[PDB]
Swiss-Prot record:
The gene is DCP2. This is m7GpppN-mRNA hydrolase. Changing residue 52 to Q: Loss of decapping activity. Decapping metalloenzyme that catalyzes the cleavage of the cap structure on mRNAs. Removes the 7-methyl guanine cap structure from mRNA molecules, yielding a 5'-phosphorylated mRNA fragment and 7m-GDP. Necessary for the degradation of mRNAs, both in normal mRNA turnover and in nonsense-mediated mRNA decay. Plays a role in replication-dependent histone mRNA degradation. Has higher activity towards mRNAs that lack a poly(A) tail. Has no activity towards a cap structure lacking an RNA moiety. Phosphorylated at ser-249 in a MTOR-dependent manner. Expressed in brain and testis. Not detected in heart (at protein level). It comes from the Eukaryota. Belongs to the Nudix hydrolase family. DCP2 subfamily. Found in a mRNA decay complex with LSM1, LSM3, LSM4, EXOSC2, EXOSC4, EXOSC10, PARN, XRN1, CNOT6, UPF1, UPF2 and UPF3B. Forms a complex with DCP1A, EDC3, DDX6 and EDC4/HEDLS, within this complex directly interacts with EDC4/HEDLS. Interacts with DPC1B. Interacts (via N-terminus and C-terminus) with TRIM21 (via N-terminus and C-terminus). Associates with polysomes. Interacts with LIMD1, WTIP and AJUBA. Interacts with DDX17 in an RNA-dependent manner. Interacts with ZC3HAV1. Interacts with APOBEC3G in an RNA-dependent manner. Interacts with ZFP36L1 (via N-terminus). Interacts with NBDY. A motif (Nudix box) lies at residues 34-55. The chain holds residues 96 to 244 of 420 of the full protein.
Length: 149
């Protein structure tokens, strides 16, 4: 897989993260991110995708050593951590063909795993609209503990 880059944007209180809602195959909520172009540096791809998806420019706030990186089915995903962005910021994409909605969500209320169907004696997972965000939630809570406490 071609690696992906983007951002976990947090507010001033560190309670809330900014998620985006796509369409079709991307129909639930996730962190803003996308596929790197040939020759493009990681930090630049991250700023481009977030600006295309949210209308907010992160270039002057990115710290090159502050990110969470996951491998998901042999595709690397890296999200730069961007704290302290005010909750009254107005977010407006270019691409409204791709993004249904943008919202702040409480970190303590987001799931860190999907629920089984063990009450139905059935295998697999129940659907969850946060499916794409889920893998980052526990590593984010751990990173915020270490960095801030
Ligand atoms: C955080 C608040 C709720 C999100 N809003 C912007 C927004 C919501 N949905 C969208 C779809 C396309 C383009 C922009 C938007 C800013 C204030």
């Amino acid at each position: 897989g071609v690696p992906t880059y983007g951002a976990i944007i947090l507010d001033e209180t560190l309670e809330n993260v900014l998620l985006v809602q796509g369409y079709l195959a991307k129909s639930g909520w996730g962190f803003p991110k996308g596929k790197v172009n040939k020759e493009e540096a990681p930090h630049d791809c991250a700023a481009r995708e977030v600006f295309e998806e949210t209308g907010f420019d992160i270039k002057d706030y990115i710290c090159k050593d502050d990110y969470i990186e996951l491998r998901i089915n042999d595709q690397l995903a890296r999200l730069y951590i961007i704290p302290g962005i005010p909750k009254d910021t107005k977010f407006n994409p270019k691409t409204r063909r791709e993004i249904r909605n943008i919202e702040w969500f409480s970190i303590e209320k987001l799931p860190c795993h999907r629920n089984d169907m063990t009450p139905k004696s059935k295998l697999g997972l129940a659907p969850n609209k946060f499916f794409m965000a889920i893998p980052f939630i526990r590593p984010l809570r751990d990173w915020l503990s270490r960095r801030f406490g």
